[PDB]
Amino acid sequence: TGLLDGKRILVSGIITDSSIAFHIARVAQEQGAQLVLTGFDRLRLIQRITDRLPAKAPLLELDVQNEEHLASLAGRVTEAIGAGNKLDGVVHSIGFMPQTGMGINPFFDAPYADVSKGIHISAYSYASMAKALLPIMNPGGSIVGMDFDPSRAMPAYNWMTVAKSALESVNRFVAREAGKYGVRSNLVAAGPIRTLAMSGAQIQLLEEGWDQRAPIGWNMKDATPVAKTVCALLSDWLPATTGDIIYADGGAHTQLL
Amino acid sequence: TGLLDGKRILVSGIITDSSIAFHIARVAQEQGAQLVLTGFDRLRLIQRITDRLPAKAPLLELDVQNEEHLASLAGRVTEAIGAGNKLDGVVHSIGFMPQTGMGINPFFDAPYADVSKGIHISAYSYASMAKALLPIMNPGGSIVGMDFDPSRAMPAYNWMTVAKSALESVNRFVAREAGKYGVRSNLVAAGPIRTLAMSAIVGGALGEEAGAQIQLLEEGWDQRAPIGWNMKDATPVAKTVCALLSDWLPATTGDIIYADGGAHTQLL
Amino acid sequence: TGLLDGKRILVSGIITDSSIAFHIARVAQEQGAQLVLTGFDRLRLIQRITDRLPAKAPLLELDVQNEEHLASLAGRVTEAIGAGNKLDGVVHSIGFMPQTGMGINPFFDAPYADVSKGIHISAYSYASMAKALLPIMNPGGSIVGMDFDPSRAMPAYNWMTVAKSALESVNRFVAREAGKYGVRSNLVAAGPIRTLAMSEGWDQRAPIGWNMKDATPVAKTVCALLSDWLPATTGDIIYADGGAHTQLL
Amino acid sequence: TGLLDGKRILVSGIITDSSIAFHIARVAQEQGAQLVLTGFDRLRLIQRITDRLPAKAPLLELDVQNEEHLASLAGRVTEAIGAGNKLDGVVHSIGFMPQTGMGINPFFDAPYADVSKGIHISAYSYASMAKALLPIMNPGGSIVGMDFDPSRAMPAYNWMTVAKSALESVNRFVAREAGKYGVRSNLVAAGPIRTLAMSAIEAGAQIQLLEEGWDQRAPIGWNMKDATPVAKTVCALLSDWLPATTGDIIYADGGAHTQLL
């Protein structure tokens, strides 16, 4: 069996065992993929977190704002997977916005320097990651990013909403590039998942609306249905979708109430 | 293995071996599913087409406009799959619109009697298949219909575009009903496929504009599609459909998956 | 001054003085438009209602399901407005769904005859009115229908939601036909208005608030679209809902 | 009247007489509006240009990346219009992307410094103009910004497409802030118009085919040489005739975005 049997897949964004990335990595492994992980800040500790996966996997450092990590990244990856092998899969699960662009902070009070850093990490970095990895990607491959539906405004999400609108744009253009390698590019738009990144009456009402609107419910504490949706895109069962967004959100975005 | 291993699935809409429904059925059978097939009008002929599938599947008659067939459907289905068994999957791959409502024929000249029948078969029937069959679906099941992106108008497709807009709306409401059974409901928005459904409309426009426009409309897909589109090849859409029938999209209902090469995400 | 100064405008859909169409007509007449009105079933009663408007307007019978009514409409309208005169504007503010397709009746329990009737009246008729009327419209003219955002499923609205999705599709093909005459076609997606038809936290989502008792903001939007001030928008939807549709909460 | 009779409206973005801001301001003055104009770099020649408007109007300098222009903006406006007088309208008609993110330059080779610059100016400044000007806006006012439908990717527009997507998100959050003041915020997504910014973005031949393409898809047709249907739409949203719409987008594109072909 194995939905992802034989596939070599890069997975960024594990920071804890609650990380959406951690769960994509797990399910991908249960499904036959061989993975290469990347980690941003506390490599020593991410290494421990990743020790908890069903199988071992190289772990490389990637600070998505660091030019040098980006230039060296294709090279380091081939070393890890064995020269003469390419990636079949890439998962961008990275995101950041300064606190001032975030929750209770006045929307107008977030300075551009702060807005720019968050756009850098959350939006521009999807393109730079694709730039780095596409030369080492096989035909029939799949790049997947993580998205939270920015098509309407809402409390707290603030300038991250903006960064996700930009990310959706970037996705459409990356797909144009990836098409040349016979590679798909897509976003999974997830419901709220109880994560290190997630984290008063505003937020609660906002997050309660998923389970309510979703004809099949939504569980903020279960990352697996979103993980499976990501693998679905990494697999050969969505061969004809690109520059697109799959909604893994219990159907919530299709229901007014 | 078997993406659809052990799953029992109803596939409607086979009329020729080049039907999207034919190719959904076959990929499904290749992936371990056991099928029930429904066919509309020329059953003797359809059985001959369905004989060409790699595995046995029983073939029931279903005129979507016939209240008795829909009434009898659930029972006839359970007869075929054995009592105490239920479907995990249902494929609606059916569509009709009179000549009047399509192609070279002026948009304003389609009488409502014709549009009505088009929308009956093409949009309403989605809800009525769900009504008939949800009673015999397992939790975690999946209903899947076929769409052609109606978000923008376009030459020739005319009143079928109006049908598909309605379908998309029915799909969101069907998702609400189905959610109570642990069942998903989604559509696949396929790019254009060399099926036989567009044929007479194509033949009629041969000399005129929108014979040309249809060709240009059609050929724009591969142009926009950042990974290309190939109208002779139905298997990328059959796969996407199976993907939705499987357990690998457990969090999506009321929704539309575009199997179109990325075409709808690009302006050119 | 007078946004609609000199325009000649057909308004359908008045049944009471709470009707969106009544308010569209009042505002339009306040802005210098001269109107032709159409009424469905209760014409003596409707004349009673339309006497309450600032000015006079011929009142013509139109059952949108009656085909001989459609065939005669344009001739009847040209007698109303006089020889050599044309319509600058058409307002379609008609809708209907059997109770079977709505509210509390289980979605699945609506017979197709009921659904098909609601669709004929609420969506196809936008096309047949456009058909009947475009040959007597001026270039620069404007056809406007009423919408309620069916992009997402919702309680109660049920099969009207479907009829509206249909309507949105028809508008876009109506726009292709209308452009052949230099005419625009659009829809106004309104927030809920306490109307005959009939009609909680819309005011919530709306950044500028929403008053279900106030038809005027929507009537005004319809008028902006009949005017020369949106000369480059067609096959489109303008949202007169206080911005509600652009906010998750 | 005078669609805009007696209204005080600020218009940014005039650089030449083929500018979309130039036509908005001209139409606005034709409709009875009293204006205050802002200009970016070439202020002396912006003054020559605005001398070509139907009525004279105060010109202020505003570089949207200059925090002190923004801090003083309100004061200089009130002083331009007289104390105790507030604005009814704000028009954001400004954008920039460095060439690296902007045509045949590969999409992947745009340095984030260049992209961040274009986003600052094309998207972020919409919010920063609202923050500065809302404290001097009357209830019932309108803020309007300029858009180009970025819902689908396309050749040439590149990272500017990404900026517009962000703008659209920004617009909906400004609507939230503006609402508290009784003020609307909305974008006009226009079809292509031949402005300094269009050139650029060979040259002549791609334009003729864009002119042709857009015109065909548009049910009411499209003339890239004529800004006045777009200026009118902006005046419509500045007027009292669109009182129930914010956080939104009005397409003045001849309907082209509604048609596949």
Ligand SMILES: NC(=O)c1ccc[n+]([C@@H]2O[C@H](COP(=O)([O-])OP(=O)(O)OC[C@H]3O[C@@H](n4cnc5c(N)ncnc54)[C@H](O)[C@@H]3O)[C@@H](O)[C@H]2O)c1
């Ligand atoms: N959790 C949710 O409800 C939610 C919903 C939809 C989408 N998303 C998106 O999913 C993705 C993963 O977030 P999460 O919810 O798993 O939170 P998380 O805390 O688990 O992950 C955030 C990750 O981003 C990484 N990161 C930050 N800066 C980086 C940089 N400079 N270079 C490389 N990596 C960097 C961090 O290391 C961390 O692994 C994000 O893109 C997020 O916006 C989250």
Ligand SMILES: NC(=O)c1ccc[n+]([C@@H]2O[C@H](COP(=O)([O-])OP(=O)(O)OC[C@H]3O[C@@H](n4cnc5c(N)ncnc54)[C@H](O)[C@@H]3O)[C@@H](O)[C@H]2O)c1
């Ligand atoms: N072919 C394409 O390019 C394409 C693209 C997008 C979507 N679609 C959709 O795919 C679906 C299948 O179409 P296709 O292209 O395979 O054409 P097709 O001719 O193979 O299928 C149409 C099917 O609908 C059936 N049908 C008609 N009336 C019926 C009724 N009264 N009761 C039961 N069945 C009835 C026909 O018997 C036929 O099998 C349709 O919904 C169509 O709109 C097709």
Ligand SMILES: NC(=O)c1ccc[n+]([C@@H]2O[C@H](COP(=O)([O-])OP(=O)(O)OC[C@H]3O[C@@H](n4cnc5c(N)ncnc54)[C@H](O)[C@@H]3O)[C@@H](O)[C@H]2O)c1
């Ligand atoms: N009021 C709201 O909250 C709301 C919101 C969005 C859209 N709309 C739409 O606006 C339009 C007007 O509805 P309303 O709210 O003014 O209520 P209304 O009851 O005043 O309007 C409905 C009109 O449709 C007419 N009609 C029904 N069948 C007809 C037929 N066969 N031929 C000709 N006319 C026929 C009725 O006579 C009536 O005048 C409808 O399209 C409705 O869907 C209403």
Ligand SMILES: NC(=O)c1ccc[n+]([C@@H]2O[C@H](COP(=O)([O-])OP(=O)(O)OC[C@H]3O[C@@H](n4cnc5c(N)ncnc54)[C@H](O)[C@@H]3O)[C@@H](O)[C@H]2O)c1
């Ligand atoms: N021309 C078109 O086809 C088209 C189509 C849709 C939308 N738009 C949008 O319309 C707006 C106006 O563009 P245009 O086409 O009229 O071109 P334009 O060149 O005439 O005007 C663009 C303006 O942006 C200004 N600008 C750049 N950086 C600035 C800054 N730091 N501070 C203040 N102003 C700055 C320039 O001075 C110029 O006045 C832009 O936002 C553009 O994206 C243009």
Ligand SMILES: Oc1cc(Cc2ccccc2)ccc1Oc1ccc(Cl)cc1Cl
């Ligand atoms: O993008 C996200 C979206 C959610 C869902 C959510 C949104 C708003 C209210 C409630 C829940 C949860 C986490 C998300 O990721 C991040 C958020 C902030 C930062 Cl700094 C970094 C990341 Cl990675």
Ligand SMILES: Oc1cc(Cc2ccccc2)ccc1Oc1ccc(Cl)cc1Cl
């Ligand atoms: O829904 C469809 C969509 C297409 C794609 C296409 C559209 C227009 C031009 C070229 C190709 C092709 C066929 C489709 O099905 C039908 C069409 C008509 C009838 Cl009567 C019945 C069916 Cl099933």
Ligand SMILES: Oc1cc(Cc2ccccc2)ccc1Oc1ccc(Cl)cc1Cl
């Ligand atoms: O389209 C409409 C929309 C509303 C606003 C509303 C929507 C949903 C929940 C609550 C209120 C109100 C009335 C509407 O028109 C009709 C509805 C039914 C019938 Cl039979 C006829 C018409 Cl004309």
Ligand SMILES: Oc1cc(Cc2ccccc2)ccc1Oc1ccc(Cl)cc1Cl
């Ligand atoms: O936003 C725009 C959109 C267009 C329409 C267009 C798109 C693509 C091909 C042809 C025309 C034209 C000009 C636009 O403004 C700018 C573009 C670039 C720069 Cl640096 C600055 C501005 Cl202000």
